[model samples]
Target: ASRGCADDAGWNDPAMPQKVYGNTWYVGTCGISALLVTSDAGHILVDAATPQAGPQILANIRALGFRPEDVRAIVLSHEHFDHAGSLAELQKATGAPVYARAPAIDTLKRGLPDRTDPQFEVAEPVAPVANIVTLADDGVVSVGPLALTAVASPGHTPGGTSWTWRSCEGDDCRQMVYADSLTAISDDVYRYSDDAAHPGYLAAFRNTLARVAALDCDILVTPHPSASGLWNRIGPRAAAPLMDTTACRRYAQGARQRLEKRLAEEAAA
Candidate 1:
């Protein structure tokens, strides 16, 4: 049975769990994105949708014939409520330690982001993650035979991160790039071009874009499924092939253009 996802699915909308490639599985909602990279030794889970989606995510994992207790590690893309909100619940269920960037630690621990986050004013508080391991800007998280690398991409939020790993089906292995949100959105009061207020934040964001573009990305996924045209590329409803080497570069280019346009609007306002 092929249960496809809707383009306008909500964050809490239930989705059928499907294999992304090899051992990697898309176990998130129709709108949000959570991935499960499996191995016989253990499994690694990335992102837990909204707080309301915790049970759904768990169900999805189980539906794929995997035990929740077998999940060894939980990683994140950013500390936003929409993505990291359910980490506390998931950690409790799986007994897995969560990993996130140093800058995102406080937010994860406190269940709220500080002023450093561009969306601080509008951001919702999540349940505080109990056990969190601080990941380096370019740290490699290893679980059994799996090694997922963390890449700093902190533009959407102060501690935003992207992850990469290799998934194999027999002799053919693909480099999977789980890029973070690159959209330059913020609260009405926050300004990306405000050097006096934000210092080198804008420059760092640009650098992040470049870094994502240059990644060894054979297949690309994002926190938001729609961000990467994921539905069109993989899953039961997919019409195109999953392997797209130019995906990261094109994704970054689009983000760069959006940022430039946002900056221009900010200047005009």
Candidate 2:
């Protein structure tokens, strides 16, 4: 079930989980990492490199037998510094247009009004966002061997997206993957993070949870690689189905409950 406590929970130092969902190979950044989904002739890369790790990420992709330009798209979860830190630079280097929800785009367009974040004193300076490929509700961007279907699961931000993979699995067993957008009220999404108290956060968190649980995912990928032990939680390729999809279900529930309680606290206050 849900194992992490209400904190980092010592997940930062965990290893990365590079699992295959069909023909698509999912690589990552240290925090849950971004994914690299390759089609028969090209690849779709998610998230740009942070300035600290951008070039190295680019180099690693080349070493992995893929060309940088082969990466056609970059989808961002939000504009949070940890996630969107390198988006602008990566976009320039790769020329891959960016995809994000509208509010994040607005936030990126506007600078931080006040640097008095309850969780932190300052938000990162807005970097130059790459060319944006805006996706409205129910938007789908299909590539050859795979497609990214967008569900605007906000709360994490105005433009938080919960993406579903189609056609990325392999011959042995195919599965869906998830990028978590909400966690406990204490989480990055529900707490002091920008837009944490956004109106749609609670509903979006629940809706995304109910929606994904209905999916036939063989695995659920949490944003915190450490929380899910993704790096070290390698399953035998054959055991994917047996590992229990409930973990993913639990992932959603834990976050929902966290948010719900937070809402209650606000009401009580």
Candidate 3:
């Protein structure tokens, strides 16, 4: 009855595209997430999974009857390779301007993260994105009737950003949040609690958690689908309803706890 994709599928595992809600479609792999927000004027693409997943993402979009050329804008959750790896390819395919925060500009341009990234030591390089457009911390990317507001969620990366927009099905509309990853993961030498070395990195991360928790999120999705329990809510064997106002708060709370635990471990070490 299903395509046999799992919540914990490989990062590049091909999966069937499905309507997330209204015009929003899940167009990425089972592990990594990419979304397509459609409108008559054009469409907006969020994230591109990994470098190798670009063609797959395009195929998924086509599977849903959307043309890559119809995608007018490409936005990101962060500058990490796993999420933004295919930006260049996607931009080329869609002829869309890639929008990212200032902190992520250099990284996106160079296809490499500098020391500012906690995972710089372990992060992989992506293809440099052309036609890049700088977006403010709270900037909104609009195409036709679609508008996605950027939320500065800088913790996973200095330029980490989350996106929110309303998706409507007839008269029923729901606020969809494409939240960036908030886990306190880093390379072996990076320390989230090192205020002197990283300035207010940890504090800023905490603020991001608080902000995401307070968002007007009726449906929440993350770069990694499992992080938001996406499959349990929308997959073929879904057990729960897709709409949940408390989902974002609960996701943020879980991330906060994980960050706290990571900090505690750092202290002990």
Please give the clash total of every predicted structure, in order: 0, 9, 0
Better of 2 and 3 by lDDT: 3
Deviation in angstroms for 173 in model 1? 0.3
Residue 65, model 2: lDDT of 70
Off by over 4 Å in 2: 1-19, 49-51, 110-122, 167-170, 184-201, 235-243, 264-269
lDDT of each: 0.93, 0.57, 0.93
Query: Clash pairs of candidate 2?
Result: 15-231, 16-231, 21-168, 21-169, 22-169, 22-170, 23-169, 29-33, 29-34
Q: Is candidate 2 or 3 superior in TM-score?
A: 3
Model 3 per-residue lDDT tens digits across residues 1-269: 88546877999998789999999999999899999999889999999999899999999999989899999999999999999999999999999999999989999989999988999899897899978899998999999999999999999999999999999999999999999999899998898888898898889999999999999999999999999888888877688889999999999999999999998999999
Give one digit per residue, the lDDT tens place, for model 1 in 1-269. Answer: 76778888888888888889999999999999999999999999999989898999999999999988999999999999999989999999999999999999999999999889999899887899989999888899899999999999988888999999999999999999999999999987889888888788889999999999999999999999999999998777889879999999999999999999999999899
Compared with the true structure, model 2 gives a TM-score of 0.75
Clashing pairs in 3: none
The TM-score that candidate 1 achieves is 0.98
TM-score to native of every candidate shown: 0.98, 0.75, 0.98
The residue-level lDDT of candidate 1 at 130 comes to 87
Candidate 1, residue 179: the lDDT equals 98
